[PDB]
Symmetry: C3
């Protein structure tokens, strides 16, 4: 853990380096089966309460099975706008659709006749891993049928009721979780796949030992980037499909960019111009190029490790890293946006905070022991979380992050002081440096042409 | 199931036809009641464990009732921006507010004195359907009071504890689900309304048989577009309001539009212009006009049937369908947006995928048996899911949808090759064809006027 | 409850006054502890079913503890774009990180040796409130060990199994809720903090009596603006951190602004200009200034009281209230946006509805007794919820809110009739009154200069 952070005063932005990558670059699909029963009907002219409880539990089981069948017979009769779209569950749904052909269920049942785990080939020629996580058929047919199938339902025992309830609870919960999500669920609960079974699926994937260890250590995130799909219920067997991620890129450098608006500080109201850098997010080296994640909601962090998803990313060249040290470079075209609004805000970075204090707003950073230790002036400034606990930007109070690290301050004149406020192209959402430069150079051309003609007409007088 | 898809090369967009509509055009409200008890106090100088368990369950019941009373005494002392706003629970909240007038609870209790279902008229003159889904009062008053009301609490039986737990669990879950949602819940769980009661409410609505059948078959979606509202707890009765949808438009044609950016392929960096069609979403014929759903999150699909919601829609004329066959028609004004960014992406359609490959990005589509089967050039292209499993657009891998259907390819020169790159109005977010045409015709007017004057001054020399 | 609403016809917007404020201006953190056990191993050569049930429950407990340890050893090896960013759980995470130093667990255990509540000082010098909400150690070590530690596991009793299940359920649920949320949860469930313990924490905060009463009455919202953070599991004790809000500003006036587009009604298609007010949200007086909440998802309402959050707000001067009575005031610069789209929509306010009816759309408001009672013309209009139940704007049907109040109608000519349609700066997303005025005054300057030169050249002929 050697996270470092730099502040660039010339553009009012910060970069945090020192992380490691774990990117998702594929999917893995398996099949999970449950062996049910087909209890026909229960009939007793009894009066004991234990028989009543047994009948109630059996009724709940039948209702769950019927609801599952009914559900099955319904499916088969700033730069966030630059991203393409895709379907997240295409592979699992394809496997589920393959499962509906005739003879597949017989193949699955024949494969797992003796053992609880096997590898079977489907019709099209794909091999998937199967499992049998529960078996209610044997217990029901060997315990409950002798009590209630033909006899007068004489005497169940008190322990049998509790045992049956404990057995049936998991199936009830699985039915409940499929029911409300219309078939496809979000992070796979403990009922769908036990923590002792997730660690067993991982030790069967065709991956390297390092990826196996990474998936085993951080198992609470593999569970948050997975899907579960209901497939079929027929011929006394239940089957659903689990879709697990694959991490093909591991241990490559990553960094994050924090940006804030940078304005001018003229006293006259409504006489200030601003610009802001719009490309803020996560960047990670990936096979000779940089991947950009702008949604700020697809990447998780565990203290040095970032678990991103490559379906909501952009592939940029390796020169995108050069916008930091220099902004007027003739090799990349950094992205900005312009406006004319002067409002104070603050951005809480990983190792400090950025404060923009424009207008008459009072901005202050305070320590918890002495009290007030800094009074910001008008501009973009940055303070580190070493002796600072909270920062206030007016009516708002923020708490800074207290991670240990090293922060550096880079001086330099702001770039907003180089432009001409009489020709600046305001209200230019999602512009770039070259576009802004082009829009300015041509207005002066019109002005000069006008001046030329005006001089010329006063030259031809005589 | 006869879904069809077309690709229009001239605008880099695709249309998928063949669906059917089921639109929500109203609400239906009912009342669900529960009959509670008013156990005052329990006192025993006992030592048996069964008495302890009974007391614990009674304490949980009292705590749930108290929490419900406390909650009740708190409420009564791209084109996604074009949509208006509305309140989703106005009708249910209105009914709940009507329920608070004096004498309403007496009317409800008198209506359901003997049967479990009745129709009653409130004060203002509206008739609603009531129900009684649970009755703990009779069981408690006829079983638990003889054990603990006055006596020394001699001997409960072991089965009674389990029976009471099973009875009380549902009320505990209902209290839990109201507690965390502040009164109004999202898709109605199995505890609020049993699957055997939802199918009974549907057979009492004033609707046609076809709508009844549609609601009965797809019951997992009627449950996802419904609300539950806590109303009152007083005079030993609990009542909450359920708000069910109504589907007034059924079996009308629908289709979806997929759009992707279309750019120019000049070699020089920063010398390309782009435009994109911004109106992508679901369209459905509705009584002589087309309804547009741009949020891309309000419509569900079950293999040919689309369950949309009409509160987040727009009403467009019937000529909006004409932007597909022609884009320069003098009857509608299709909506576009312009920029100057050249980044590669991909859009996964229903029966294929659209690939945009600009710059130095390597784009490829691969089959799972042979391997690589296509290498895209620079431009907008489209490939169908017949012999293609995955497509990669650089560092990203996508899985195409494997639905069966028929796809067609329509040729034609791209429209971006007709414009003049010296006067093209870039950075024009949310423009239209006529606006872009107007902004170009007037710059040439200024240029021609300038040329006219410049020639004229050199005509008056002598 | 004296809510009032006004409609300003000149700008097609409405204001609803009469509310009260309860703003969050800080955090409060406490520690919740659970006393576990360290059962080593269970071994019985038994055959009774009760022993089997006991062993199963013990196995579940061990699995929960192991999963918790594994999770712990993973974290330590329109104007919505104007808002700054911040970290919501900085304080709780800081306290959790402080908890990991050596000797802290010993201090916590020594503080709560005898009582269930104490105040203890950590290493850095901060005092926090601790608690002991559950004790499984004593029950396990005094009941289950005599049954299964060394003996042949002779006879458990039937009531012991149920008692142990009831004890263990809460720990199982806590483990389940941490497991799927990766450590940090959203609104604190009933398992993490009992409703009888939340009301006990509130009576220990260093706050005034009025804030205590406000927090006690509306306890279902204090629970929705809180976080729970997993911290540690070691040395036979479990500890997690709860982060509760603080309400520093209470009983200050608030109001809401509703805005809708305002267009021109020329008959020719594609010849209309529009403008819309973009600053819609909640405003609340706060210490000599107004706080603006634009996200429309951070503020809740209970019939006169608004529970907002100050982390997603903006601090504006006190002159922002002046845009309502007048829009051309020389003291503030109200924010608008321009376009050229004519589409009909509707905005449902608190005491009525705003209807915009442009083009050939049919807009109508209907009562539930007579039927149709109003037919809107082309323009922006407003109708109150007194004799009106629903309003339709085409293919869409809306339900108005039926709250009691007083509404007022303010006449005045629309401002869109003052501009010149030949120089109006369309497609100017997020503009302002002064910017639009500036962009118009300078085009006329160019036209006049052109005319001047053209006259001048025809003056020098001879
Ligand atoms: C991290 O920095 C520390 C300095 O305290 C030192 O151990 C070394 O430079 C780095 N350790 C690594 C990269 O393992
Ligand atoms: C000046 O005009 C040239 C075209 O001749 C253009 O390429 C350039 O971007 C403009 N601005 C500057 C600063 O050179
Ligand atoms: C759907 O297409 C098939 C062609 O395979 C044929 O049955 C018919 O054209 C269509 N059936 C319908 C619309 O029911
Ligand atoms: C040309 O100018 C006319 C106005 O005289 C305008 O209506 C039209 O949109 C412009 N462009 C074209 C292609 O006609
Ligand atoms: C609210 O209005 C009512 C009028 O019916 C009246 O009691 C008084 O003006 C107000 N009451 C308050 C503010 O307590
Ligand atoms: C007119 O031009 C002046 C600059 O001389 C500018 O300040 C003003 O905003 C423009 N418009 C009006 C209506 O005065």
């Amino acid at each position: 853990q050697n996270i470092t952070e730099e502040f660039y005063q010339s553009t009012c932005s910060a970069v945090s380096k020192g992380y490691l990558s774990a990117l998702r670059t594929g999917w893995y699909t398996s099949v999970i089966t449950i062996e049910l029963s087909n209890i026909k009907e229960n009939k007793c002219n009894g009066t004991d309460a234990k028989v009543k409880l047994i009948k109630q539990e059996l009724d709940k089981y039948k209702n769950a099975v019927t609801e599952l069948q009914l559900l099955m017979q319904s499916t088969q009769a700033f730069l966030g706008f630059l991203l393409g779209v895709g379907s997240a569950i295409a592979s699992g749904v394809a496997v589920s659709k393959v499962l509906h052909l005739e003879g597949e269920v017989n193949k699955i049942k024949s494969a797992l006749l003796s053992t609880n785990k096997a590898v079977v080939s489907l019709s099209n020629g794909v091999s998937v891993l199967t499992s049998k996580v529960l078996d209610l058929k044997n217990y029901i047919d060997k315990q409950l049928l002798p009590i209630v199938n033909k006899q007068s339902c004489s005497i169940p025992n008190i322990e049998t009721v509790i045992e049956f309830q404990q057995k049936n609870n998991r199936l009830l919960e699985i039915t409940r979780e499929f029911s409300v999500n219309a078939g496809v669920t979000t992070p796979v609960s403990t009922y769908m796949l036990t923590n002792s079974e997730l660690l067993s699926l991982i030790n069967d994937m065709p991956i390297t030992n390092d990826q196996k260890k990474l998936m085993s250590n951080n198992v609470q995130i593999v569970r948050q980037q997975s899907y579960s799909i209901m497939s079929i219920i027929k011929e006394e067997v239940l089957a659903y499909v689990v879709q697990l991620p694959l991490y093909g890129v591991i241990d490559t450098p990553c960094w994050k960019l924090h940006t804030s608006p940078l304005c001018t500080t003229n006293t006259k109201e409504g006489s200030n111009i601003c610009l802001t850098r719009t490309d803020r997010g996560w960047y990670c080296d990936n096979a000779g190029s940089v991947s950009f994640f702008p949604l700020a909601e697809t990447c998780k962090v565990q203290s040095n490790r970032v678990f991103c998803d490559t379906m909501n990313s952009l592939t940029l060249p390796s020169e995108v890293n050069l916008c930091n040290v220099d902004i007027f470079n003739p090799k990349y075209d950094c992205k900005i946006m312009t406006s004319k609004t002067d409002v104070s805000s603050s951005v809480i970075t990983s190792l400090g905070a950025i404060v923009s204090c424009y207008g008459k707003t009072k901005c202050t950073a305070s320590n918890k022991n002495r009290g007030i230790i800094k009074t910001f002036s008008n501009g973009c400034d940055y303070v580190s979380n070493k002796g600072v606990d909270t920062v206030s930007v007016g009516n708002t109070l923020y708490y800074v992050n207290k991670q240990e690290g090293k922060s550096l301050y880079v001086k330099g004149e702001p770039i907003i002081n180089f432009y001409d406020p009489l020709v600046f192209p305001s209200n230019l959402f999602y512009a770039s440096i070259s576009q802004v430069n082009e829009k300015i150079n041509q207005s002066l051309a019109w002005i000069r042409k006008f001046d030329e003609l005006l001089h010329n007409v006063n030259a031809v007088k005589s």
